[PDB]
Design goal:
The PDB classes it as membrane protein. This is part of a larger assembly, with chains A (about 190 residues), B (about 180 residues) and C (about 70 residues). With about 190 residues, chain A is an all-alpha fold. Chain A is about 45% helix and about 0% strand. The two termini of chain A are about 35 Å apart. Chain B is mainly alpha-helical and about 180 residues long. The longest helix of chain B is centred in the middle third of the chain and has 27 residues, at about 50-75. Classes of the chains: A mainly alpha (about 190), B mainly alpha (about 180), C mainly alpha (about 70). Bound molecules: digalactosyl diacyl glycerol (dgdg), 1,2-distearoyl-monogalactosyl-diglyceride and the ligand CCCCCCCCCCCCCCCC(=O)OC[C@H](CO[C@@H]1O[C@H](CS(=O)(=O)O)[C@@H](O)[C@H](O)[C@H]1O)OC(=O)CCCCCCCCCCCCCCC.
Chain lengths: ~190, ~180, ~70
């Protein structure tokens, strides 16, 4: 311990400012697109409880921005031109057509990813058999849901596969992936 | 500063004069092929008299070099700065009289131009000492040149403004007017 | 000649797709009236009390009012 005065039984890890705004409220963790305007869960709540929609909009757009999304750097004064083209130099009708196309594409991609996740579930349920050598044939639903929401780093997947292959033990899961912080260099980016 | 600049250039010019004159053996006079193949030293080398008399002059410029390095590194804050007036005379009087002889060396029928390694430092140091005396008489404050250049620049600005307003484009046209 | 005219036609069709302002938010560096942006206002001279009358008819002819 370094602590001269006070030291709880778990060491204090210095948490820092968040560097990115949270996912909105309307989004899901997966690849399938959101909902154009209103989410679906809004229909199963009290009218005097659905104020969190507009509050979340206010928070992401105006009042809770982490001072790291307001750094003036040389990369951002060029991204400004890209974005200003998209928002002021392109007519909203072409933007609307592109929006529809991109939605359709994302639905196809999400369908593909779901197919792949189910395939992975069979594969690892098969690998646990080699691992235990004997009976074990199940898989972990926790890991399936964590794979669908992109909550695993590749190293965690590899170590889980190895643990399965060697000792069965289908219920021992890697911890969880932490979100990536915004990269900053200097006046540069 | 200004007097400091003069004294610095004096010490370095005399340093060069010595470090070039002695660290090499000796120079060789112009041959002038066909110059009276008999005597009178025409088309010949040099000799004891010349060499040693010159080796002297080098020591004289060394003496004034050391005097000037002393004055610079001592009164660079320009002990007490004033009574150096003694040394000042010893650095000016000699100087001017030296220049006098040099100013009549052409009339004396001397060849001062063929050998730069000797006369250069003498002439340059005489000029530097004389201009140092002059600047110490009127105290150029190293900021008065700034006032001179500002005066000439103000004059030429006043000139180009008149030229522009008379021959190129009136100032009442190019500048904006208020109130409407 | 067909290519060299098709270029201009594409530009004109793009300018057509805009159609207006719906989609453009207000901007504070570029208000809609150039006098705000340029800081222009009258002075003390050149202001007659008989001017407002003619002012009005100019207005009446700009807004389309056919009465005059
Ligand atoms: C093929 C179909 C093209 C039909 C048409 O009339 O095509 C012409 C279109 C431009 O169409 C204009 O498109 C306009 C789009 O307006 C819509 O979009 C606007 C913002 O884009 C405004 O919001 C407006 O209110 C909203 O209705 C209206 O439809 C105009 O009537 C229509 O002339 O150009 C184009 O195809 C796009 C040009 C791309 C050329 C490269
Ligand atoms: C390929 C580019 C590598 C980037 C992949 C990142 C994967 C990742 O996050 O893994 C997951 C972990 C990172 O781990 C992250 O760490 C964070 C703390 O910083 C938190 O712990 C997060 O939870 C955790 O996700 O990656 C590794 O542990 C390091 C992987 C290094 C791979 C670099 C390969 C490039 C090396 C080539 C050079 C060859 C020279 C010899
Ligand atoms: C000359 C350029 C020299 C720089 C060399 C490039 C360095 C490498 C790329 C930098 C890391 C990217 C940072 C990041 O992704 O920010 C998030 C950015 C938006 O920038 C962000 O945009 C934000 C505003 S908004 O998102 O656009 O509304 C804003 O908050 C933020 O400050 C701004 O950075 O999102 C992008 O999609 C950037 C993708 C472009 C990458 C191509 C790099 C070209 C090489």
């Amino acid at each position: 311990t370094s602590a001269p005065f006070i030291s709880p039984m778990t060491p204090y890890v210095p948490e820092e400012e968040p560097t990115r705004t949270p996912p909105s409220i309307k989004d899901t963790g997966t690849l399938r697109p959101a909902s154009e305007w209103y989410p679906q869960w809004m229909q199963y709540r009290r009218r005097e409880d659905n104020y969190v929609f507009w509050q979340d909009k206010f928070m992401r757009c105006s009042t809770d921005i982490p001072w790291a999304e307001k750094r003036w750097t040389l990369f951002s004064t060029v991204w400004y031109l890209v974005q200003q083209l998209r928002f002021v130099g392109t007519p909203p009708a072409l933007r609307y057509v592109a929006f529809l196309g991109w939605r359709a594409l994302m639905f196809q991609v999400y369908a593909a990813h779901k197919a792949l996740v189910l395939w992975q579930c069979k594969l690892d349920a098969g690998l646990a058999r080699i691992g235990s050598g004997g009976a074990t044939a199940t898989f972990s639903k926790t890991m399936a849901l964590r794979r669908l929401h992109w909550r695993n780093s590749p190293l965690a997947e590899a170590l889980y596969a190895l643990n399965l292959y060697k000792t069965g033990r289908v219920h021992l899961l890697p911890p969880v992936a932490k979100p990536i912080p915004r990269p900053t260099f200097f006046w540069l980016f | 500063t200004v007097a400091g600049l003069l004294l610095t250039t004096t010490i370095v010019v005399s340093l060069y004069g010595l470090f070039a004159a002695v660290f090499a053996p000796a120079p060789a006079l112009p041959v002038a092929v066909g110059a009276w193949p008999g005597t009178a030293a025409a088309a010949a080398v040099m000799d004891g008299s010349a060499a040693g008399l010159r080796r002297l002059a080098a020591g004289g410029l060394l003496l004034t070099a050391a005097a000037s390095h002393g004055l610079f590194d001592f009164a660079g804050s320009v002990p007490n700065p004033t009574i150096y007036s003694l040394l000042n005379l010893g650095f000016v009087a000699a100087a001017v009289l030296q220049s006098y002889f040099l100013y009549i060396a052409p009339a004396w029928g001397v060849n001062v131009n063929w050998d730069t390694a000797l006369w250069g430092p003498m002439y340059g140091t005489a000029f530097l000492g004389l201009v140092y005396g002059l600047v110490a008489l009127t105290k150029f404050d190293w900021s008065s040149v700034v006032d001179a250049v500002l005066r000439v620049a103000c004059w030429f600005a006043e000139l180009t403004m008149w030229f522009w307003d008379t021959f190129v484009w009136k100032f009442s046209w190019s500048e904006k007017t208020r109130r409407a | 000649a067909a290519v060299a005219a098709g270029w201009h036609l594409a530009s004109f069709a793009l300018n057509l797709a805009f159609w207006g302002v719906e989609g453009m938010p207000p901007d504070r560096y570029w208000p809609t009236s150039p006098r705000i942006r340029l800081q222009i206002r009258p002075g003390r001279y050149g202001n007659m009390d008989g001017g407002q009358r003619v002012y009005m008819d100019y207005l009446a002819r700009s807004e389309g009012v056919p009465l005059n």
